[PDB]
Amino acid sequence: IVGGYTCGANTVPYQVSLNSGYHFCGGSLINSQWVVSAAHCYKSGIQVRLGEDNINVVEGNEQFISASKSIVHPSYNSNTLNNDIMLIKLKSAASLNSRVASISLPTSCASAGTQCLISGWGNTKSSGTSYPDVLKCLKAPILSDSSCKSAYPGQITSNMFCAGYLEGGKDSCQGDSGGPVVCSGKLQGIVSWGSGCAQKNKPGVYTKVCNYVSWIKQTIASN
Numbered sequence: 001i002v003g004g005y006t007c008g009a010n011t012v013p014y015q016v017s018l019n020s021g022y023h024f025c026g027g028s029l030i031n032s033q034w035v036v037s038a039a040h041c042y043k044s045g046i047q048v049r050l051g052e053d054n055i056n057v058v059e060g061n062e063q064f065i066s067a068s069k070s071i072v073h074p075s076y077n078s079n080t081l082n083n084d085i086m087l088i089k090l091k092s093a094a095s096l097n098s099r100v101a102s103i104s105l106p107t108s109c110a111s112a113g114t115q116c117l118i119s120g121w122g123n124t125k126s127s128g129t130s131y132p133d134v135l136k137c138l139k140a141p142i143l144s145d146s147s148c149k150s151a152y153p154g155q156i157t158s159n160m161f162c163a164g165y166l167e168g169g170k171d172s173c174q175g176d177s178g179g180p181v182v183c184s185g186k187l188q189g190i191v192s193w194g195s196g197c198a199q200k201n202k203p204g205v206y207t208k209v210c211n212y213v214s215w216i217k218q219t220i221a222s223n
């Protein structure tokens, strides 16, 4: 997160860290046994880390649970990032509490101009790199279709939306990838892609979760 703020310990209790020996992506806890992340975050050997603030220090509210299964969206295209969503099933149920909590799935898609919360442990610089220890947050509005498509001509599908600031300096970035965009208390976006980070006229692009809730519900009902 570039240009954001320190969230505050466990104030984003659905935020997870995905760890394969190191933090590599975020995710969102949607019930005690399932995480939503980005398909481009796929890899083997994932451990889900819940209840984190400083990812490099055991502070006492963590739960570390290995993934039993990862399920990439059947129509994910890594070239276009169309359908950039994955489900991760935990080997055991998380114990839900004030600091580890699920976020609701949408029943309606979010509106342009809605102010959302984006969070993660990704890069905090727009050029170069600096990776934080504690969770960072950004408030950002959903942009119009017109602005999103003009920013990224021929690349925005109906399964994507833009959020952030066309003027630059405030965005998500690699390492936030796979993490939440929460709007009105629902998981509406997944950190997916963009050109650099926090560049003028190149806002963040987010997987449009509301398009996937049928697939999510059916998949978790059978796995």
Ligand SMILES: Nc1c(Br)c(C(=O)O)c(Br)c(C(=O)O)c1Br
Pocket (backbone or CB within 6 Å): 106, 107, 108, 109, 110, 111, 112, 114, 183, 184, 185, 186
């Ligand atoms: N207040 C509110 C708004 Br504004 C929007 C929206 O962005 O249009 C949505 Br999709 C919801 C919802 O999550 O149903 C709610 Br609650």
Ligand SMILES: [Ca+2]
Pocket (backbone or CB within 6 Å): 052, 053, 054, 055, 056, 057, 058, 059, 060, 062
């Ligand atoms: Ca920790």
Ligand SMILES: [Cl-]
Pocket (backbone or CB within 6 Å): 145, 146, 147, 149
């Ligand atoms: Cl348009």
